[PDB]
Amino acid sequence: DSFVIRGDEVRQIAPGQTGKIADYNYKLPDDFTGCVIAWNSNNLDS
């Protein structure tokens, strides 16, 4: 699952994490198994 997020609130992507993104946009399950990869793409989008 690939998309773009802000510098902050990246920590909201986790099992049982609260936040507007995690509560209305993309909610991971509590029993998730897998990896989360974040890397800066500012000069490719800003």
Binding site: P15, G16, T18, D30
Partner: protein
């Protein structure tokens, strides 16, 4: 205390059952001994624990 042998069985059974029921009011380390409170004041990830 003539019939004490018969009375002791009743007393022991009632006392063990009373202890079993009273054990429901202990935290055992949780925040509260009431299940609904700790499931309705915490997120599920911590409610589980």
């Amino acid at each position: 205390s003539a019939l004490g042998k018969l009375q002791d069985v009743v007393n022991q059974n009632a006392q063990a059952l009373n202890t079993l029921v009273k054990q429901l009011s202990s935290n055992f380390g949780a925040i509260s001994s009431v299940l609904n409170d700790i499931l309705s004041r915490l997120d599920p990830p911590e409610a589980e624990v």
